[PDB]
Write a protein that binds this ligand. Structure first.
Ligand code: SF4
Ligand SMILES: [Mn+2]
Lengths: 343, 218, 98, 342, 343, 98, 342
DNA sequence: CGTAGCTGAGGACCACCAGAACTTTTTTGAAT
DNA sequence: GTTCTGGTGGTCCTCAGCTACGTT
């Protein structure tokens, strides 16, 4: 819960928070489930329909601690704080760096380097896992191509070059992704990619996964103090959460497509739940979306290890914590922002 | 006049005659009545505060409700709202009990004390009326105003008594003449409950001949 | 005048004379207006009838156990009343022919 | 100064007017058809066979809520009349005055003066707003005829003379009353008077208007305090509402037949509504009756300004205030009774 | 049930009434109880909560018969009439006669002669009935005085003289009245008349009786259309029914004083039911008042004969029938007003 | 405008799904106002919130089976209300010092 | 054109705020004290230890309703702040205008100009009603010298200058404040605006007024979408939360000091309504607090006319409009901020 | 904790049945 | 035909109570 990052991540639903002396107590239906100190904490994030003992609220407000309250799943509800601390300077720095282009180019090239690393290693593991019926040398050649592209992106200096060298990898990934899946390959196809109302079932279910990750990343930004509607690589525009999209593109790897292949394979999803209305639209059936959301929650419960921090956690906390490091970049404690990087 | 005991006028007429010399004429000669909000409230208070067949005493004084009275000198009969008898060896013994008591008339109403005499006159009659039956001398009166819930003493002198006598004489003359006069209207007939009868408007307007001739020539 | 006045009552039948009070209040209030829903009446009265009805009901009920509310809509009520359901009320200003 | 309370017309047959406290209830073989508060009524009119419980009539008589019974065509079958009240001054004055022929003339002067003024002014209103539709100069000639005649009527002395002049004015006004069918076909052409059977149209509406106006004038006069069956004019035929006829002689012209002409000219009624039996004179129709009564009760709520009293009052009160302006004259608060000179 | 002088009174309560053919029919819960022809009736008077029948209402109102509905105790409720209403020439005749001395004195003579005859005959009857407890000489002397006084009053022509004779007759009867009581003289003693605030017991009782009788007679007049407030002997003043007081002189003694003395002598009540007042006034108790009313109602059902016409009828119809005769005097074939000369 | 309107309902619970309709109607009407009596609420609204409430409440009830009445007083409602019994109502212009 | 909404004060300790649909309910060990609809509330203030349901905080934060927690003597704690709702260009403009001394000194110029104008004119008004109590001359004196500073403030281009001038307006007015009182001077410990933050009498009401005004202005500004308690004008020093109230430095001197002085002069608060602890702190009695809050709401309800267009406006809208105009200036439609000048 | 869905447990509110009766003086009563 | 007082049953109405869950 209490990560090395100075936040509290109480995620068990229907818990309670109360105050004992100078420490927080997590009550689990009227017995002392947990006890934590408050001497080194900086912010508290609370999931679930719960409460806080007003003594805890009063003790947190004075000593520069913000109490953020969400739902269980991760939607954003409210924030409690006195004379606001740690938002004005952070947001002003965000806007100042948004004005200039050199730092924006640096950050965007960092993100694209992370994405290409993730995809290349995903292909490496995919060809290692099942070396029976797969084009191994083709995937190796694509791997060398993306290694050179990774070096070039690390050698980038302008936004236009970054956009040009990003756009190239899309079609290569599209073809290799269509070749990637193992089970039910005959039954589902990925010949063409469409962002606007989609054709093919796989594209639509990618769209749904993208929307879920969208809501998650938006809440991830909102819970720390940064904006939503001005981005670094994507240009500013009224009504579009550009920073959200930038982080989406950074994390569109393991967290989205691996879930796609897992749902498609293992015969956990069937063709009876997918439909067609005159334009390729895949109207998700209610049972299909119920199973999808249950599977998403189950996956979020899966434990992994952070590549950078090293601390064991859930999948559901992977975005927020990652986004939180972004804040520690804008506060001057970090030199860069590696999501998945060697350095 | 059955035996001269029938040609009597009620004490309720005195207040009306004092207020709107037309109003007494409308009520007691044409025998008609009409009620508005204030009249309803007044009647309801008078009815609720009416508790006959019961006496209330405090060991020293006695109180009587709905006391029937009449006076031959003025030929005026009526009902006193409350009579208070006090114990002292000064007055006249009265039928029913022992000891010697003096009398005080009490009449409740609803409204602020009025700049004109009005209510006073009515009360005075009561006191004077009582002197004929309980053979004594009365020189005090009590008025209770329930809108302020206050109580005011009223002295009596020869001025008030002579005014009451003259008023009764003139009232009897008007009754014998079956005549309803006219008064200066002004703004008091905005709560005159008989405003839909006495018609203050036509009292000031032009003669009928001028209007008919006015609409005849053109 | 003929101002529109709305009367609602609410009596308690758990006490000694609850049913008697309910019967008497319903009979006393039905004398001036009509019934649109249970425990509500709407009437078209002058000021004097309103005062008389108020005095009668105030004398009849007992305090600290019942409730009575009197609203008045003024003389422009035709554009203030809206009905949706299926319990129509006869109005008393149209030709009123049976 | 009153409120012009409403009025109840019951048309469905075989009902029964019962009383529950202050409510009038319409029962029909134990089936309830409705109930109305009785403080919001003025008169209750019954059609056909409608019986009344003695308690109901006894309650309605004492609060000047009149009850009337009609068979099919507004006949005078039966009304209700209550007790007498203790206001002997007005009744003694009225009886003594009616015993004196000179005062009879001094009142009939104003009655007929108001009547002829009503006729003339309405004729001029009709002429000036209608162009080629009417014979204009004949209307104009009748107008100065009436205007000169009114001054002569104003100085009459004996009842017979006033009756003669009233008849002259009546014929000289019917002569042009026959001329208004402006916006309807020939079936609404006046062709004289028939008394007991309404053998034609127009009569079948004028009869209804006259009955519904008489039953209002009588109620107003008995409300004010007078007795309504002895008169200042007419031959005193026994047992007829003579004073009601006298007081209606003024608003009949401007309040009933003007209404029928307005109803016809607006084409609010169609000749298909009426029908006829083997002889059957002319009988109106149930939807036709409903339309007549709806238009009547709708017009009875127009607000005017009264000429003499100078107040803004509703149309239906006019037959009441006039009667009240009668009463005070008997007590001498005026000089002579001002008739309605709309 | 009974038809007297072309009128029809239905005195028994709860009997519906309807029309059949051209006849009136009485009913009592679907039981045929009476049939009467309507060829030669003049009015209908009801006493029950009947309601009549609308067929008969229309029939009579068309055939110039008015209907009057009362209550079973005689109070006036309503009058159904058509155009005629009947009483116009009668009321005009009353009003014309009310303002002349000759005719008013004639009718006053008619009333007073009946009064003195009834008083004298009652005195002589009581002398005859009871020997021992009577000063016979005083009563016989007063009887001779009253006979001479009646013969004199028959020939009066001036209002003042008739008023004086009435006063003298009243004085004689009053100075005789006290010894009429033959039981419970302890507190029941008559020593004068004081109508307003009545004093000392029995006086109040007498007053009450008069009031009831007056009201009864009042309703009687309204049955036929006589204007109850314009008298003949008594002069008219607003608020008082002068003609009722004129009429109820002849019926005052035999019908009120006899009733009171019967109540006193038969020990029908005791003085415990009268409460006290400080000035000497006397009032009645609710229980005593109700017993008085019940006794009056029961006595009203006594059945006697009619001295002038002979039909055997109840006491309760005496005030009406007489009143009817009064009406038949004003416009009819009556030579002179017939008093209630009852031995 | 922030002016007062009074809402009354009458839904029958003997029909097929009467209990559910009653529950939903009461819950929907309690959101925008205050309960002064059983089946009688009063509330302070503008035009837009009143339109929203009317459109929301028109669908929960069913016509030809229920009754619903809306009365509208005006912007000076302080002098058009009387209370006599023992069911006091909180006013929302009183400083509300809880 | 917006309309004012109410405010809910909670003083009972150990209560609980809970959500039900759109109603806020108060409980204390499952005892429903009352429920209030949330569509006609503007803010919610709580004393003591009161908790809220996270659904309620989410609802209020989404729908622009401000929750604030307080303790005994208005010691501010735990404001409820929501999220970023959009209009990003307005925030861009505001963030660019800061850290540039030209526009910053323009806005400081207008702010302190408004403050000085209000102080001077209020002092002149007070010496204008009743001149017998105090010395008019000296009061007039102060007036002109403040007027002098006015010219200087308009001829200013540097922020570092104005702070110094602040001290002058902070030392050329305190010398009048002690003479501001009229009645009960000896009882109320009245050492002028000599202040002590832990409270030393006749400053409890002053601090209470300041806290209420600060919360009100913070909510009014956040409704439009900007934060200015430490912004372009006020110093970068943390913990000096006054610029949000410096937007109301036009109103901090006026609407709070005037309120305190009116209560004191109108003899409506008695010295028994306060007390002091053992150590020396000063607190207010509960009944006095209720009286103060009732008076504050009643004053905030009273309705006046704005100088700009004259559309008839209420007092609680005084902060809100001052926010809204600050938007329109940053959109470039006007030239410079027009402050509130009475 | 909030949002729904099922119960039940009493009160409020009103429409039918059943029975037993059913009559009372005269004066007071507003007016910014 | 009313009017008042009991008795009966059947339907609106709100609260206390137990289960089953919270993403588009
Ligand atoms: S005008 Fe009105 S108030 Fe004046 S005397 Fe006549 S009725 Fe009375
Ligand atoms: Mn009195």
């Amino acid at each position: 819960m209490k990560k090395l990052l100075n936040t509290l991540y109480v995620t068990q639903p229907d818990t309670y928070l109360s105050l004992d002396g100078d420490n927080v107590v997590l009550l689990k239906e009227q017995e002392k489930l947990g006890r934590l100190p408050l001497h080194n904490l900086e912010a508290i994030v609370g999931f679930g329909y719960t409460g806080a003992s007003p003594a805890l609220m009063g003790y947190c407000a004075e000593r520069n601690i913000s109490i953020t309250f969400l739902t269980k799943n991760g939607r954003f509800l409210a924030r409690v704080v006195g004379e606001s601390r740690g938002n004005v300077v952070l947001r002003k720095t965000q806007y100042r760096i948004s004005e200039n282009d050199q730092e924006s180019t640096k950050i965007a090239r960092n993100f694209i380097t992370g994405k290409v690393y993730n995809s290349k290693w995903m292909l490496e593991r995919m060809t290692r896992e099942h070396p029976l019926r797969v084009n191994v040398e083709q995937f190796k050649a694509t791997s060398q191509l993306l290694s050179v592209m990774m070096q070039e992106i690390r050698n980038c200096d302008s936004l236009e070059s970054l956009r040009g060298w990003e756009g190239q990898a899309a079609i290569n990934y599209n073809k290799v992704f269509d070749q990637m899946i193992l089970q039910q390959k005959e039954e589902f196809a990925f010949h063409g990619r469409s962002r606007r109302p989609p054709k093919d079932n796989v594209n639509a279910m990618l769209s749904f996964a993208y929307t879920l990750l969208a809501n998650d990343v938006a809440a991830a930004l909102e819970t720390v103090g940064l904006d939503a509607y001005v981005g670094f690589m994507h240009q500013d525009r009224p009504g579009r959460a550009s920073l959200a999209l930038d982080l989406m593109e950074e994390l569109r790897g393991l967290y989205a497509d691996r879930f796609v292949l897992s749902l498609i394979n293992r015969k956990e999803m069937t063709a009876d739940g997918f439909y067609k209305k005159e334009n390729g639209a895949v109207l998700m059936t209610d049972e299909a979306r119920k199973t999808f959301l249950k599977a998403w929650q189950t996956k979020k419960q899966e434990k992994i290890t952070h590549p950078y921090l090293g601390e064991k956690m859930s999948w559901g906390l992977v975005p927020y914590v990652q986004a939180l490091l972004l804040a520690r970049f804008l506060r001057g404690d970090l030199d860069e922002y590696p999501p998945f990087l060697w350095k | 006049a059955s035996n001269e005991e029938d040609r009597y006028l009620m004490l309720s007429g005195l207040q009306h005659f004092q207020f709107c010399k037309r109003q007494w004429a409308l009520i007691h000669i044409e025998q008609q009545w009409e009620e508005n909000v204030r009249t309803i409230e007044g009647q309801h208070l008078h009815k609720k505060a009416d508790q006959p067949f019961m006496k209330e005493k405090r060991g020293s004084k006695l109180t009587v409700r709905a006391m029937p009275i009449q006076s031959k000198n003025l030929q005026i009969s009526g009902i006193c709202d409350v009579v208070e008898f006090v114990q002292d060896s000064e007055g006249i013994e009265l039928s029913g009990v022992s000891g010697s008591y003096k009398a005080f008339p009490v009449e409740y109403k609803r409204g602020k004390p009025k700049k004109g005499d009005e209510d006073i006159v009515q009360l005075v009659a009561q006191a004077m009326c009582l002197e004929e039956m309980l053979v004594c001398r009365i020189d005090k009166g009590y008025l209770f105003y329930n809108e302020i819930k206050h109580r005011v003493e009223v002295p009596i002198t020869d001025a008030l008594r002579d005014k009451v006598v003259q008023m009764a004489k003139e009232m009897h003359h008007y009754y014998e003449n079956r005549h309803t006069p006219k008064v200066k209207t002004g703004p008091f007939c905005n709560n005159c409950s008989l405003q839909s009868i006495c018609l203050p408007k036509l009292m000031n307007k032009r003669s009928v001949k001028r209007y008919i001739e006015g609409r005849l020539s053109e | 005048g003929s101002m529109l006045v709305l009367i609602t009552y609410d009596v308690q039948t758990s006490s000694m004379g609850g049913t008697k009070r309910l019967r008497k209040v319903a009979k006393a209030c039905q004398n001036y207006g009509q019934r649109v829903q249970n425990s509500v009446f709407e009437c078209i009265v002058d000021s004097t009838q309103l005062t008389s009805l108020k005095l009668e009901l105030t004398s009849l009920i007992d305090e600290e156990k019942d409730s009575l509310r009197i609203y008045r809509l003024g003389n422009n009520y035709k554009t203030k009343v809206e009905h949706i359901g299926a319990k129509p009320s006869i109005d008393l200003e149209d030709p009123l022919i049976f």
